[PDB]
Design an enzyme around this catalytic site. Structure first.
Site, short mmCIF file in Angstrom:
data_model
loop_
_atom_site.label_atom_id
_atom_site.label_comp_id
_atom_site.label_asym_id
_atom_site.label_seq_id
_atom_site.Cartn_x
_atom_site.Cartn_y
_atom_site.Cartn_z
N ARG B 228 0.83 -1.21 0.00
CA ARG B 228 0.00 0.00 0.00
C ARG B 228 0.87 1.27 0.00
O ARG B 228 1.96 1.32 0.62
CB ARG B 228 -0.93 0.03 1.22
CG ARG B 228 -1.88 -1.16 1.32
CD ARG B 228 -2.96 -1.08 0.27
NE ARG B 228 -3.92 -2.19 0.33
CZ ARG B 228 -4.94 -2.28 1.20
NH1 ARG B 228 -5.13 -1.35 2.14
NH2 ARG B 228 -5.75 -3.33 1.16
N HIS B 276 0.67 0.77 -10.23
CA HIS B 276 -0.18 -0.21 -9.53
C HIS B 276 -0.66 -1.33 -10.45
O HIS B 276 -1.87 -1.56 -10.59
CB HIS B 276 -1.40 0.46 -8.87
CG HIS B 276 -1.94 -0.33 -7.72
ND1 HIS B 276 -2.56 0.26 -6.64
CD2 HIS B 276 -1.83 -1.64 -7.42
CE1 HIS B 276 -2.87 -0.67 -5.75
NE2 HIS B 276 -2.44 -1.83 -6.20
#
Lengths: 310, 310
Positions: B228, B276
């Protein structure tokens, strides 16, 4: 006499470090770095790109070539039959499959996951997830038989890439479609997205990676050169990169090494380069081989790694 | 009635492509992309970052979150108890160990073989073989329990790197030294050359990769962030890269995504970045999961992948 005399010569390695490790490996030996003008006897010579005067007229029990790749030395000896009495055995260090595997696996995945594209996107500060490549369209083609090629194929098929190999001799590596001879070269190239060159050299492979070969690869292909510089026609490679035939290339070897600073390869944004370090024999390993082989010779036991001087 | 109505919403995916694949997967269903103002009934909702008005007041048999990472949606629902009737089951797509493995194995090897250094040397047209790193000094430390971390560890220990993991809960992965709790975090960090973050999130890990943590890594370390963005204090990372505490970093996730163009990360020469994409579920796989789960619900059979809305 009766001390064993060993002489050592390497163009760029740390002579002091090698002389030392050698002294500890063969404590009963006198080891010395060879310098021009040193014509004092020796029993064994450890060399890389030796000058003629180092070995001319020497009576030696054996010469050890500091690396795999006996092509350079054999041609100097064959073009100078007077450099090493032809009765003297010549040895070479190939147990470097792991090194090749690391290099190839890292780069093939790097390309597969488009890290090269993402780096360019980074340099433009542009957030852009790209389409993903299927394993099916990301076929690996290895040129060359021999353990290195076999090891690299083994490690890449484990990731699920379709694998093919091409050599002059027919082969049967598990999970790999084998292509043989110039007759099957086009079929092999046509289906190969990532071309990996692991050919030991031959007169018949000089400049093999030229436009005639690059033209048979599918557009958006890649070239990974891990074998010999003379296998690649550099102008044709660059042309293929500039036309889009090749998306990228990584080269560990070059037609001339060190690659002159003048070469445009240094300058191409889609060429990655390493200074011939894909697979170097660890000095500890090299030293263990050499000391072990000297011991077998002193005792008249069987040796391994001898190079026939055909 | 009795046609099954499905609605679909994603901020950046090709709605048309997904609607289609869905139609073929569940031929007996009417699927449509949701657009603002569409309050016509639906039975199932496929969503990512859905706006409130898409789900508010809807009677649904189930909602499918298009991705792993239910933290974002749960907080919108928990901060908006009125967005989804709490009796409606919520599902998520983790079978992406392979993707993570590809990413981590490629980059850890990339760093181990100094391709980052060689690229800089290329950009300076300087031929310079560099000292080689030992496997012993190239220890990998994975933060986070769970399959992804376990898969990544498995694939890296196969290359012979020393491996350690750190989590809040005690673990026992084969061939990996397990470190547990903030009590053993320093010991873990002190011995880790390559820090890989695969932590599912927690209140207790926000900004965990800050200077206090980076200070315990040995100099010349690396950070690979696959978990994250909020786990990394970006200013501290950059400071560690600028001081030499960190040789390099690769980040697939960021505190804010898309990472604003203003961020200096885009600009650092020793940060690699991917938008991502480390491990996205293949749409084919996502679609197979969703259709399969809908079928189980229609038939009252057991389902899997349900997210508890604690």
């Amino acid at each position: 006499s009766n001390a064993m005399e060993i002489i050592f010569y390497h163009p760029t390695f740390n002579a002091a470090w090698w002389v030392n490790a050698l002294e500890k490996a063969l404590p009963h030996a006198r080891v010395r770095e060879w310098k021009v003008g040193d014509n004092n006897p020796a029993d064994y010579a450890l060399v890389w790109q030796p000058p003629v005067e180092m070995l001319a007229g020497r009576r030696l029990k054996a010469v050890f070539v500091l690396g795999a790749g006996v092509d350079a030395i054999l041609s100097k000896l064959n073009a100078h039959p007077e450099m090493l009495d032809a009765s003297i055995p010549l040895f070479r260090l190939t147990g470097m499959g792991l090194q090749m595997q690391e290099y190839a696996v890292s780069q093939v995945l790097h390309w597969f996951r488009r890290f090269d594209d993402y780096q360019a996107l980074k340099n433009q500060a542009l957030w852009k997830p790209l389409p993903e490549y299927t394993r099916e369209e990301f076929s690996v083609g290895i040129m060359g038989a021999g353990v290195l090629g076999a090891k690299v194929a083994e490690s890449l098929q484990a990731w699920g890439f379709p694998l093919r190999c091409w050599s002059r001799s027919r082969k049967s590596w598990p999970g790999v479609e084998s292509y043989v001879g110039r007759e099957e070269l086009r079929a092999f190239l046509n289906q190969t997205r990532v071309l990996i060159n692991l050919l030991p050299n031959t007169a018949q492979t000089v400049g093999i990676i030229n436009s005639e070969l690059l033209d048979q690869l599918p557009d958006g292909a890649y070239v990974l050169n891990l074998a010999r510089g003379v296998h690649v026609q550099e102008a044709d490679l660059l042309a293929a990169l500039d036309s889009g035939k090749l998306k990228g290339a990584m080269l560990d070897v070059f037609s001339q090494e060190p690659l002159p600073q003048e070469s445009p390869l240094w300058r191409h944004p889609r060429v990655a380069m390493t200074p011939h370090i894909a697979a170097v024999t660890r000095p500890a390993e090299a030293i263990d081989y050499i000391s072990r082989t000297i011991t077998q010779l002193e005792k008249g036991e069987p040796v391994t790694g001898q190079v026939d001087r055909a």
